[PDB]
Amino acid sequence: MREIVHIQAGQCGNQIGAKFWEVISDEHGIDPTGSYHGDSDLQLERINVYYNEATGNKYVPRAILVDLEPGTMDSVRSGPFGQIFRPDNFVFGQSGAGNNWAKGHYTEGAELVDSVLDVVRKESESCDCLQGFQLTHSLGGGTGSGMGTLLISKIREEYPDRIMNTFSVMPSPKVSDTVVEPYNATLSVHQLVENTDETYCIDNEALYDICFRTLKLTTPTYGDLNHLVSATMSGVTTCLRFPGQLNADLRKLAVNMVPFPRLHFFMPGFAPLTSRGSQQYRALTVPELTQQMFDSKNMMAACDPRHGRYLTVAAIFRGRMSMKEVDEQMLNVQNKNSSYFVEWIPNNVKTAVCDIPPRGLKMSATFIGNSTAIQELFKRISEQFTAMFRRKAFLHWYTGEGMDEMEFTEAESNMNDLVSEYQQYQDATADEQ
Amino acid sequence: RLKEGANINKSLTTLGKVISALAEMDSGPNKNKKKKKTDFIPYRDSVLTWLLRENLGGNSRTAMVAALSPADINYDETLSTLRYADRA
Amino acid sequence: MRECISIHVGQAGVQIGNACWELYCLEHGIQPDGQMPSDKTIGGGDDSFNTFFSETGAGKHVPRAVFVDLEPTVIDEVRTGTYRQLFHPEQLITGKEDAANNYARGHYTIGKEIIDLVLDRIRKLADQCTGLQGFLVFHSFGGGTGSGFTSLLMERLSVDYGKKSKLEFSIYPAPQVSTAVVEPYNSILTTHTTLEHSDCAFMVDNEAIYDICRRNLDIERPTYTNLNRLISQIVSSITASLRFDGALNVDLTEFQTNLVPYPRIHFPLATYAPVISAEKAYHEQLSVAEITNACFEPANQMVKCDPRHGKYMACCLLYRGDVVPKDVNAAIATIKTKRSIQFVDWCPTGFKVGINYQPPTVVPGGDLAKVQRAVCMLSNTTAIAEAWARLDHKFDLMYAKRAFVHWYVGEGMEEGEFSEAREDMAALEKDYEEVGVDSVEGEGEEEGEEY
Ligand SMILES: CC(=O)O[C@H]1C(=O)[C@@]2(C)[C@H]([C@H](OC(=O)c3ccccc3)[C@]3(O)C[C@H](OC(=O)[C@H](O)[C@@H](NC(=O)c4ccccc4)c4ccccc4)C(C)=C1C3(C)C)[C@]1(OC(C)=O)CO[C@@H]1C[C@@H]2O
Numbered sequence: 001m002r003e004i005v006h007i008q009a010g011q012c013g014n015q016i017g018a019k020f021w022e023v024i025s026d027e028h029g030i031d032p033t034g035s036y037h038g039d040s041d042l043q044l045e046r047i048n049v050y051y052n053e054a055t056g057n058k059y060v061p062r063a064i065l066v067d068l069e070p071g072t073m074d075s076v077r078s079g080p081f082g083q084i085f086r087p088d089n090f091v092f093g094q095s096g097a098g099n100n101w102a103k104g105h106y107t108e109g110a111e112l113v114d115s116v117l118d119v120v121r122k123e124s125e126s127c128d129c130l131q132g133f134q135l136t137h138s139l140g141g142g143t144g145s146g147m148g149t150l151l152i153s154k155i156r157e158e159y160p161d162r163i164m165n166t167f168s169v170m171p172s173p174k175v176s177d178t179v180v181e182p183y184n185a186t187l188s189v190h191q192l193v194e195n196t197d198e199t200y201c202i203d204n205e206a207l208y209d210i211c212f213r214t215l216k217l218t219t220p221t222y223g224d225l226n227h228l229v230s231a232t233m234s235g236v237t238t239c240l241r242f243p244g245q246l247n248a249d250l251r252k253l254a255v256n257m258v259p260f261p262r263l264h265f266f267m268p269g270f271a272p273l274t275s276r277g278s279q280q281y282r283a284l285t286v287p288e289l290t291q292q293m294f295d296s297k298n299m300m301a302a303c304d305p306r307h308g309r310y311l312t313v314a315a316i317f318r319g320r321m322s323m324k325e326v327d328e329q330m331l332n333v334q335n336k337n338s339s340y341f342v343e344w345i346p347n348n349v350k351t352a353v354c355d356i357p358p359r360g361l362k363m364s365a366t367f368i369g370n371s372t373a374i375q376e377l378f379k380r381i382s383e384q385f386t387a388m389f390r391r392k393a394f395l396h397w398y399t400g401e402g403m404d405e406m407e408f409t410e411a412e413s414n415m416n417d418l419v420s421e422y423q424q425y426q427d428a429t430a431d432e433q
Numbered sequence: 434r435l436k437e438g439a440n441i442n443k444s445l446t447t448l449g450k451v452i453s454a455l456a457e458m459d460s461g462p463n464k465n466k467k468k469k470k471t472d473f474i475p476y477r478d479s480v481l482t483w484l485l486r487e488n489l490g491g492n493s494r495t496a497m498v499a500a501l502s503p504a505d506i507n508y509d510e511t512l513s514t515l516r517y518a519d520r521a
Numbered sequence: 522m523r524e525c526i527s528i529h530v531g532q533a534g535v536q537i538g539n540a541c542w543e544l545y546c547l548e549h550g551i552q553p554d555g556q557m558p559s560d561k562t563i564g565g566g567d568d569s570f571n572t573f574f575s576e577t578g579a580g581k582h583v584p585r586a587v588f589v590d591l592e593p594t595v596i597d598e599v600r601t602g603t604y605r606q607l608f609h610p611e612q613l614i615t616g617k618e619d620a621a622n623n624y625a626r627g628h629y630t631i632g633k634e635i636i637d638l639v640l641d642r643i644r645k646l647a648d649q650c651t652g653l654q655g656f657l658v659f660h661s662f663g664g665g666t667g668s669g670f671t672s673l674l675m676e677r678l679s680v681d682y683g684k685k686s687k688l689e690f691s692i693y694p695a696p697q698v699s700t701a702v703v704e705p706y707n708s709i710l711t712t713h714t715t716l717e718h719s720d721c722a723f724m725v726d727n728e729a730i731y732d733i734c735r736r737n738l739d740i741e742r743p744t745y746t747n748l749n750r751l752i753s754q755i756v757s758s759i760t761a762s763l764r765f766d767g768a769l770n771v772d773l774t775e776f777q778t779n780l781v782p783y784p785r786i787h788f789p790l791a792t793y794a795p796v797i798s799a800e801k802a803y804h805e806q807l808s809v810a811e812i813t814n815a816c817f818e819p820a821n822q823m824v825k826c827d828p829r830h831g832k833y834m835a836c837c838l839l840y841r842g843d844v845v846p847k848d849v850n851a852a853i854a855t856i857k858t859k860r861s862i863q864f865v866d867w868c869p870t871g872f873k874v875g876i877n878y879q880p881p882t883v884v885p886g887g888d889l890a891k892v893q894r895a896v897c898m899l900s901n902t903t904a905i906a907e908a909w910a911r912l913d914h915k916f917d918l919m920y921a922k923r924a925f926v927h928w929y930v931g932e933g934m935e936e937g938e939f940s941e942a943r944e945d946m947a948a949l950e951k952d953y954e955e956v957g958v959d960s961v962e963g964e965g966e967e968e969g970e971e972y
């Protein structure tokens with residue numbers, strides 16, 4: 001029985017985690033109290049992936065909530081699904097990081113990491129066969145980035161042969177909420193690129209574009225963005241929990257997607273997405289899902305795939321559908337858009353099919369791309385980083401916590417190296433000498 | 434034992450890749466004198482090649498010596514060694 | 522327990538404290554007597570927010586404030602006023618004379634024999650706190666007590682506590698109007714202490730507040746009460762992030778992390794956007810974009826300086842009420858395309874955003890309309906240099922002839938101190954003139970193998 005431990009750190013991580021536990025607790029019929037009131041018999045078959053069993057026929061998730069400020073925890077407890085979580089997993093302190101990466105990594109988070117690791121070790125030792133971990137956090141913040149990277153490092157030290165996913169919300173060009181986003185993002189990417197098997201790229205501008213242009217929401221709020229995120233996180237791991245014609249574990253996705261160890265930054269997407277009144281005007285078929293998946297406006301990372309080349313892509317379909325349609329559609333997408341796919345991989349489309357769709361839909365699909373265009377993201381941060389590092393704009397707040405100026409140089413060099421491989425595979429031939 | 438073997442094999446494969454990449458551009462320039470940008474030699478896919486970055490690359494010299502036992506029982510050893518020496 | 526300790530020194534500090542505590546008591550449902558009927562009617566709650574008020578067993582709520590002054594009059598006004606039974610009776614007021622617009626008298630001669638009592642009561646209040654965040658010190662430049670005693674108290678606080686933030690709200694002398702002949706000496710003397718020992722100093726000018734009251738609120742004859750109420754609104758907007766829930770909370774450490782590039786530059790300006798009368802509250806939308814734009818206008822600044830003559834180094838927006846993130850993002854994007862607003866090239870990001878659900882309250886007998894949305898802006902720029910430069914000129918015009926100097930030396934000072942202080946101020950201006958300069962050039966290059 002494959003089982004995954006969920007960790008959520010910081011405000012963004014906690015909010016996305018709460019919404020995620022409501023989407024996964026409505027597909028596996030779970031009452032907010034924790035009882036089961038579902039209808040289908042397949043809901044309980046694989047409940048142990050996310051939930052532990054409690055004595056009164058109750059189910060408690062494996063979530064572990066971390067934060068250096070208590071207030072967010074209260075907002076989780078005083079909520080629709082606040083009582084579902086175990087009280088002992090609310091590990092927190094006081095005097096938050098204050099959007100300082102150094103405080104999250106070195107000064108404050110170092111005191112609470114021992115308690116968090118105690119809880120994580122207790123949760124993992126009871127698992128029959130641990131598949132891996134998940135972490136939801138934000139790179140542009142304080143406790144989120146620093147504590148997440150520290151926990152990732154410690155866990156990979158203790159559990160080297162287990163998958164470590166990561167759903168990170170990174171900075172964006174125009175929608176920026178902190179003035180020191182570049183430093184935090186750079187020092188976080190310096191850690192993620194080394195100690196993570198899969199990283200998913202999310203940014204708020206792409207989600208806002210989806211809300212405004214596809215869903216046509218007039219006044220989107222953070223709930224809708226977390227809704228889309230939760231949809232994709234549920235889509236990624238659908239095959240561990242349900243049967244299908246062609247399964248795809250997390251490890252299968254990792255093996256097929258990453259060609260080399262350091263290229264594990266992915267662009268996620270979900271289909272279908274319609275705006276209420278338009279629902280009756282669009283027929284739901286596999287070609288429609290394939291068309292919407294590969295559209296550049298549907299991506300969640302604000303990186304246009306047309307500026308690069310797809311190293312790999314993966315498509316996880318949910319619903320009763322014909323395998324011939326899936327195969328022909330993926331082959332047609334590869335053949336028509338031959339310029340946007342790398343040439344030294346003969347076939348770079350993983351396909352998986354699961355039988356049971358979401359609750360209120362007949363068919364659905366999740367898309368995980370790995371393309372060179374992601375380099376642009378890092379490059380942007382690097383530019384801003386140097387624009388602040390040449391003058392040491394806010395550097396004393398970091399060096400006052402026991403840091404040194406060399407670490408910034410290490411992080412910048414590592415990000416620049418990472419951009420190199422992408423830029424390389426990005427061209428569309430190499431003949432001349 | 435399995436962990437040690439896997440890590441050793443990964444490091445050896447990365448070292449083979451970096452050595453092969455280094456020799457090719459070498460020959461290339463030495464004859465093409467062109468400067469095909471600086472290509473990209475994967476130094477960071479392992480600590481071993483990372484620490485030896487200054488020695489492997491740049492103006493340097495390199496030579497790998499391989500020993501091949503002589504029995505008829507160690508055939509499965511010897512051939513494999515040649516296959517690793519066939520690189521570079 | 523995001524606790525803060527408020528300090529009020531001098532007449533100006535005490536009056537701003539009266540306005541502030543009126544607003545705070547109105548916000549929390551605390552009656553002037555000291556009791557809260559809301560919990561009695563409901564049966565319990567968190568309305569006794571620990572940020573300002575400590576709850577005793579009987580249900581009374583005592584403020585976490587400390588009042589200090591050398592004139593008994595200003596505090597005998599509050600000891601017999603409406604809020605006599607709110608404050609702890611120990612008010613720390615020296616039954617003696619006053620500093621008499623003399624920094625030396627307030628710092629060296631009479632500032633002693635009271636400072637020990639103030640620090641003892643600060644110690645007692647601090648021991649009662651768990652997770653104390655910082656200090657909010659209210660005083661006024663130019664006055665004897667508010668300058669000298671504030672410098673002494675800040676020095677002792679920095680010696681004792683050290684790592685706790687110390688935010689300062691102060692009244693700078695205006696360019697033209699003044700209420701004393703020896704304001705520049707006192708201000709130039711206290712700058713040497715506020716530069717080192719404070720962490721972030723917010724400056725307000727009475728001429729600016731008078732102009733805002735005349736233009737926006739249609740008040741032709743304002744008094745200090747209106748100015749104190751505006752300053753109270755600003756401080757409430759600053760502190761509201763750690764008292765009520767919100768979409769994006771901004772603590773007192775994020776403040777200093779995001780608004781202070783270098784340690785010697787912590788002098789931001791402050792503005793409040795929706796300053797409007799009840800009659801003019803209609804015929805207006807008061808959307809997020811409107812208030813955000815109104816924050817940037819030179820006419821609405823609370824210090825007589827023009828932002829167009831300098832460059833913006835950092836900006837922090839704190840929204841209250843019915844605000845959603847997408848409107849804030851749209852307003853920021855709209856501002857970033859304006860050419861009249863220039864940002865330093867070494868701060869590509871520029872903006873800090875915080876959102877709070879609690880809307881602003883209305884003080885009975887006040888002048889500000891009830892509004893659904895509000896925003897308080899805090900902006901670290903280089904235009905503030907101008908506000909110092911004028912003062913320096915005045916100081917020179919008095920120090921060339923050693924006018925009014927014998928009063929200062931008679932109370933324990935020497936002449937050289939003045940010179941030292943002046944030099945320190947000069948250095949500070951130079952730092953500003955150095956931080957807003959553009960980067961040198963590309964300053965480094967690479968070639969793509971030109972062979
Ligand atoms: C009448 C009808 O067809 O209802 C649909 C519906 O109208 C549409 C518009 C739904 C609706 O989605 C939204 O309007 C929406 C708004 C903001 C952010 C995200 C979604 C729906 O809310 C979403 C909802 O999805 C589910 O019921 C799934 O189980 C879904 N779970 C949740 O959304 C959920 C959220 C909170 C609490 C409990 C469940 C899900 C999706 C993916 C993976 C796992 C679960 C469905 C089918 C619909 C409504 C209700 C209108 C759509 O969304 C999804 C994710 O399917 C919009 O694109 C689809 C197309 C659907 O036709």
Ligand SMILES: Nc1nc2c(ncn2[C@@H]2O[C@H](COP(=O)(O)OP(=O)(O)OP(=O)(O)O)[C@@H](O)[C@H]2O)c(=O)[nH]1
Pocket residue numbers: 530531532533534536537591592619620621622623627660661662663664665666667692699700701727745746748749
């Ligand atoms: N905004 C505002 N400023 C005030 C107020 N009261 C006094 N001031 C300013 O304070 C300055 C005078 O210094 P004070 O604060 O009165 O100094 P003090 O408390 O009297 O201390 P001493 O000079 O020793 O008596 C004047 O120039 C005023 O502009 C007030 O209620 N609101």
Ligand SMILES: Nc1nc2c(ncn2[C@@H]2O[C@H](COP(=O)(O)OP(=O)(O)O)[C@@H](O)[C@H]2O)c(=O)[nH]1
Pocket residue numbers: 009010011012013015016099138140141142143144145169176177178204222225226768
């Ligand atoms: N999707 C989403 N993003 C958020 C939310 N809150 C904050 N963010 C993003 O995270 C950044 C702020 O980081 P923050 O959450 O404060 O990090 P933390 O202090 O460690 O919790 C901003 O740039 C936002 O874009 C949220 O509720 N949902």
Ligand SMILES: [Mg+2]
Pocket residue numbers: 531532592619666
């Ligand atoms: Mg006085």
